Structure 1
Amino acid sequence: CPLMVKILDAVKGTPAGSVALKVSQKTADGGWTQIATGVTDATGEIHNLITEQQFPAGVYRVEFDTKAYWTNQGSTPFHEVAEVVFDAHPEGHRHYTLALLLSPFSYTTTAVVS
């Protein structure tokens, strides 16, 4: 599990369950190719999102459907989506955890790189 997510709901103080996300890798011509999708469980995580094989060095984009999450909770949110874009160097069993803290009009994207 070289790419992990942890999404928290800052209003409820619980992980954000059922958040749809997708992972894209930057291609040679500068475009994006989608390599995985998933939805967070009740713990705000997604296990086995991608494998080491799918996660070579490069630039990646994780897009979180935060709007749907808030719309479903009954809140009108600001952001259409939450985008996390970063260069990955996973060569060496390097784990990446994308922590995301959500409020209707704010989010925090932090990274923990082990």
Structure 2
Amino acid sequence: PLMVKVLDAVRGSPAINVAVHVFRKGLTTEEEFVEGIYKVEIDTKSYWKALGISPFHEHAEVVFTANDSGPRRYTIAALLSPYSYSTTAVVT
């Protein structure tokens, strides 16, 4: 008897992000997994990944140049931050 009870009763106006996971049981491999339930990615950069089997195997002169240089701006007042009866403001 696996019984899970979450926020059974609520009297009011809450701000919530419920996440309930009940479980009863190739160069890259992933199996039987839960990812990105609430994963906020901002300005995420992946250049060379999982290129493959025998990549640049022989006489492969490579010139990798990664330049992350820009007037970039990110302004998030509330990230994964539920708020009740409040005042949120990005004043810019």
TM-score by length of 1: 0.19
TM-score by length of 2: 0.22
Larger Rg belongs to: 2
Higher RCO (CA < 8 A, seq sep 6+):
2
Q: Which structure has greater helix proportion?
A: 1
